[PDB]
Design a protein around this nucleic acid. Structure first.
Lengths: 114, 115, 114
DNA sequence: CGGAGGCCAGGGGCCCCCGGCCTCTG
DNA sequence: GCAGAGGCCGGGGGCCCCTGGCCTCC
């Protein structure tokens, strides 16, 4: 599919930018994200947030150091090869959190309650 | 016994890189540095200088043709051998030149003086 | 100008050969031979010989390990300037010493005697 | 036999990619 | 005050020719 039309006001749809971000939102298979929830501790996330969405799963997280959106999209597409994936940066994290904690998203698990 | 903490912003700290550079700085004893300052001819330097730094000196020289960081080290190591022979490339020549001329470095000789 | 015709049956007149040789003969000047007589250590000569002949001299030596004919000419033309410098490998070295140790050749120095 | 010419490891130039940084612009 | 586009810049690492040994086959 593609990103839900809900949060398109709080994501980043740049395609030719060498700019860094401190918060991202992945979108892939439900099991990939849990296989991504734990294998992401390298960007040293300050917040992680695995959620479910229509036979698929998303992962919302916040790094303490800024990152290229291309940098984080490479990382994931390594162990995955083997399934589909897409990812965009988050320009408004606060807004983008509660849209992915409210229906039809279901909070599977997250570290720090936010 | 590495490079001074001041310089490490005008130097390359690469090691697994195959990049090429027009400027190099070598840190060794007084004897070997003077030994090198007359030897380097097979690099054809546009400019070269010999400075002192605490019971040991440094040689700073720009090259005509560019060179990768290892090939310079491999050449100079084939003179003496022999003591602390470390040399990194220089990513910021002029600025680097201005620290290795001032305190507490002692510039001794050069050709064409800091244009 | 060119290697004397009394040697054209002892030297290898190759030019496209990548073969290796344990013996060499260099045809330069009287001084540029003495200069490179004291410097050809990196080839490890078990026997080297300095001889004069006409306006310049020649260097005859044998190495502990085989070497390409190019790689010794390719080497000597760096430390020298030069004037002119010819270098052929020596095929039959026993006789090649015999002619170049005798007239019209002046023998100047050598380590081992013939 | 000698000369050609093919081989391959190591050196050392060449370059781009990657992923942070930045500024300038609609 | 936004995004987005795209400057620069340092480390990594691929390409590949050149060198100088090795070799076999005409």
């Amino acid at each position: 599919s593609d990103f839900p039309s809900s949060l398109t006001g709080y994501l980043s749809h740049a395609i030719y930018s060498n700019k860094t971000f401190p918060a991202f939102l992945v979108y892939s298979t439900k099991e990939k994200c849990k296989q991504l929830y734990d294998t992401i501790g390298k960007f040293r996330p300050e917040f992680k947030c695995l959620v479910h969405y229509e036979e698929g799963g998303m992962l919302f997280f916040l790094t303490m150091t800024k990152h290229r959106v291309s940098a984080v999209k490479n990382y994931c597409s390594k162990l995955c090869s083997v399934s589909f994936l897409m990812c965009k940066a988050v320009t408004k994290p606060m807004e983008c959190y509660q849209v992915v904690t409210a229906a039809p998203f279901q909070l599977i698990t997250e570290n720090k309650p936010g």
